Design a protein around this motif. Structure first.
Motif, PDB file in Angstrom:
ATOM      1  N   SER A 101      -0.591  -9.998  11.790  1.00 43.01           N
ATOM      2  CA  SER A 101      -1.182  -8.939  10.985  1.00 43.01           C
ATOM      3  C   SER A 101      -1.583  -7.723  11.804  1.00 43.01           C
ATOM      4  O   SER A 101      -2.034  -6.729  11.225  1.00 43.01           O
ATOM      5  CB  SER A 101      -2.406  -9.464  10.235  1.00 43.01           C
ATOM      6  OG  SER A 101      -2.029 -10.407   9.256  1.00 43.01           O
ATOM      7  N   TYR A 155       5.367  -5.187   2.275  1.00 45.02           N
ATOM      8  CA  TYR A 155       4.399  -6.137   1.738  1.00 45.02           C
ATOM      9  C   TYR A 155       3.565  -6.645   2.906  1.00 45.02           C
ATOM     10  O   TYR A 155       4.035  -7.468   3.697  1.00 45.02           O
ATOM     11  CB  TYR A 155       5.110  -7.278   1.015  1.00 45.02           C
ATOM     12  CG  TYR A 155       4.219  -8.430   0.606  1.00 45.02           C
ATOM     13  CD1 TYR A 155       2.931  -8.213   0.145  1.00 45.02           C
ATOM     14  CD2 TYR A 155       4.679  -9.735   0.669  1.00 45.02           C
ATOM     15  CE1 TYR A 155       2.124  -9.263  -0.231  1.00 45.02           C
ATOM     16  CE2 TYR A 155       3.877 -10.790   0.294  1.00 45.02           C
ATOM     17  CZ  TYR A 155       2.602 -10.549  -0.156  1.00 45.02           C
ATOM     18  OH  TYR A 155       1.800 -11.601  -0.530  1.00 45.02           O
ATOM     19  N   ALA A 156       2.334  -6.156   3.014  1.00 46.97           N
ATOM     20  CA  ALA A 156       1.461  -6.465   4.142  1.00 46.97           C
ATOM     21  C   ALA A 156       0.194  -7.128   3.625  1.00 46.97           C
ATOM     22  O   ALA A 156      -0.638  -6.475   2.987  1.00 46.97           O
ATOM     23  CB  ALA A 156       1.129  -5.205   4.936  1.00 46.97           C
ATOM     24  N   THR A 157       0.047  -8.417   3.902  1.00 48.79           N
ATOM     25  CA  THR A 157      -1.158  -9.151   3.553  1.00 48.79           C
ATOM     26  C   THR A 157      -2.130  -9.101   4.728  1.00 48.79           C
ATOM     27  O   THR A 157      -1.941  -8.353   5.691  1.00 48.79           O
ATOM     28  CB  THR A 157      -0.820 -10.589   3.175  1.00 48.79           C
ATOM     29  OG1 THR A 157      -0.879 -11.415   4.345  1.00 48.79           O
ATOM     30  CG2 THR A 157       0.574 -10.668   2.595  1.00 48.79           C
ATOM     31  N   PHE A 158      -3.186  -9.904   4.661  1.00 49.39           N
ATOM     32  CA  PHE A 158      -4.105 -10.042   5.779  1.00 49.39           C
ATOM     33  C   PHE A 158      -3.668 -11.108   6.771  1.00 49.39           C
ATOM     34  O   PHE A 158      -4.307 -11.258   7.817  1.00 49.39           O
ATOM     35  CB  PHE A 158      -5.513 -10.363   5.271  1.00 49.39           C
ATOM     36  CG  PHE A 158      -6.398  -9.158   5.146  1.00 49.39           C
ATOM     37  CD1 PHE A 158      -7.053  -8.647   6.252  1.00 49.39           C
ATOM     38  CD2 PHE A 158      -6.573  -8.535   3.923  1.00 49.39           C
ATOM     39  CE1 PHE A 158      -7.866  -7.540   6.141  1.00 49.39           C
ATOM     40  CE2 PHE A 158      -7.386  -7.428   3.806  1.00 49.39           C
ATOM     41  CZ  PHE A 158      -8.034  -6.929   4.917  1.00 49.39           C
ATOM     42  N   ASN A 159      -2.598 -11.845   6.474  1.00 47.16           N
ATOM     43  CA  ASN A 159      -2.108 -12.898   7.349  1.00 47.16           C
ATOM     44  C   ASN A 159      -0.706 -12.639   7.879  1.00 47.16           C
ATOM     45  O   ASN A 159      -0.235 -13.402   8.729  1.00 47.16           O
ATOM     46  CB  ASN A 159      -2.143 -14.248   6.624  1.00 47.16           C
ATOM     47  CG  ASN A 159      -3.505 -14.901   6.682  1.00 47.16           C
ATOM     48  OD1 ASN A 159      -4.255 -14.711   7.638  1.00 47.16           O
ATOM     49  ND2 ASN A 159      -3.838 -15.672   5.655  1.00 47.16           N
ATOM     50  N   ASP A 160      -0.036 -11.586   7.421  1.00 43.31           N
ATOM     51  CA  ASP A 160       1.306 -11.234   7.873  1.00 43.31           C
ATOM     52  C   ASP A 160       1.642  -9.856   7.316  1.00 43.31           C
ATOM     53  O   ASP A 160       0.842  -9.243   6.603  1.00 43.31           O
ATOM     54  CB  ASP A 160       2.338 -12.274   7.438  1.00 43.31           C
ATOM     55  CG  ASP A 160       3.563 -12.280   8.321  1.00 43.31           C
ATOM     56  OD1 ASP A 160       3.467 -11.797   9.466  1.00 43.31           O
ATOM     57  OD2 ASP A 160       4.621 -12.765   7.872  1.00 43.31           O
ATOM     58  N   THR A 161       2.837  -9.374   7.648  1.00 46.09           N
ATOM     59  CA  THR A 161       3.337  -8.114   7.118  1.00 46.09           C
ATOM     60  C   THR A 161       4.853  -8.179   7.032  1.00 46.09           C
ATOM     61  O   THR A 161       5.507  -8.739   7.913  1.00 46.09           O
ATOM     62  CB  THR A 161       2.913  -6.922   7.980  1.00 46.09           C
ATOM     63  OG1 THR A 161       3.696  -5.777   7.625  1.00 46.09           O
ATOM     64  CG2 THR A 161       3.110  -7.231   9.450  1.00 46.09           C
ATOM     65  N   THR A 182       9.829  -9.128   9.667  1.00 38.67           N
ATOM     66  CA  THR A 182       8.424  -9.396   9.406  1.00 38.67           C
ATOM     67  C   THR A 182       7.626  -9.286  10.698  1.00 38.67           C
ATOM     68  O   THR A 182       8.178  -9.305  11.800  1.00 38.67           O
ATOM     69  CB  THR A 182       8.227 -10.783   8.790  1.00 38.67           C
ATOM     70  OG1 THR A 182       8.478 -11.785   9.779  1.00 38.67           O
ATOM     71  CG2 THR A 182       9.186 -10.984   7.636  1.00 38.67           C
TER      72      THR A 182
END
Length: 61
Positions: free
Chosen positions: A52, A17-23, A40
């Motif tokens: 990120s 699960y990789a967003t634009f603010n973390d992964t 993470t």
RNA sequence: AUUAAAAGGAACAAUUGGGGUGAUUCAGAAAAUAACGGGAGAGGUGAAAAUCCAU
């Protein structure tokens, strides 16, 4: 010898699960209710803007 | 006291309509709760901070 609880060649499932603010890199069993290891992108960095970064993703992976 | 207007209205036959009203019914995202795993971060930004987390 063998690590306690470990078995032979088995199968897992990775929940990347990789967003634009973390992964997130999170592996569980086939059932999905038992997690093996969850790392993470924020645990392998110092500043908050690099969680990120692709570099932190492979380091966690 | 004429006819039957590519004027209008009515009727009938076949349809069209995310047109309207009522009831019924499906979906999973988000969030909340319950139980379990995990054990240190998570959010958010141009960079951060306020905030959430060992209850």
């Amino acid at each position: 010898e063998v690590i306690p609880g470990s078995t032979k060649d088995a199968f897992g499932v990775a929940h990347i699960y990789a967003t634009f603010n973390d992964t997130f890199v999170h592996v569980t069993d086939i059932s999905g209710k038992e997690t093996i290891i969850r790392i993470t992108g924020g645990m392998r960095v110092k500043a908050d803007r690099d969680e990120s970064s692709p570099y932190a993703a492979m380091t966690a992976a």
